[PDB]
Amino acid sequence: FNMKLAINAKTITSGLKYALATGNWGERAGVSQVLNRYTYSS
């Protein structure tokens, strides 16, 4: 039993990155969008 291999940090890291990098809330669409920086009011 190796604790370093029993706990896979890639699961949490990629799961959060994927759901935030794209709009796919899973493993709903358009939940995350590239922030609009054309002007301050935008």
């Binding site: 039993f1 190796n2 604790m3 370093k4 940090a9």
Partner: protein, 101 residues
Amino acid sequence: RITTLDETVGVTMSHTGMSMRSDNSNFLKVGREKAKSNIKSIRMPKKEILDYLFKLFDEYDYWSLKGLKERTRQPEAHLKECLDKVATLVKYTLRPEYKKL
């Protein structure tokens, strides 16, 4: 509130991933528990082990291989030669030539 670690980031991560430190835990070391026990044996003369098998069969009429090896404490190679000549497998049992006596 959740607790925040104020130590240097390079220090907190010294125990993560491929680190020079080696794990010193004995939890669920199943392979270690049984792999440690290992001992060999030697084939003894036929005239003595062969008699031992017949007394063993007299005690019980159906002896398993693992139990047979534990009692005999001898390599399976030599035991196989004598076992076939005397017993048969359906669990090994003594042949009717000697059992029917």
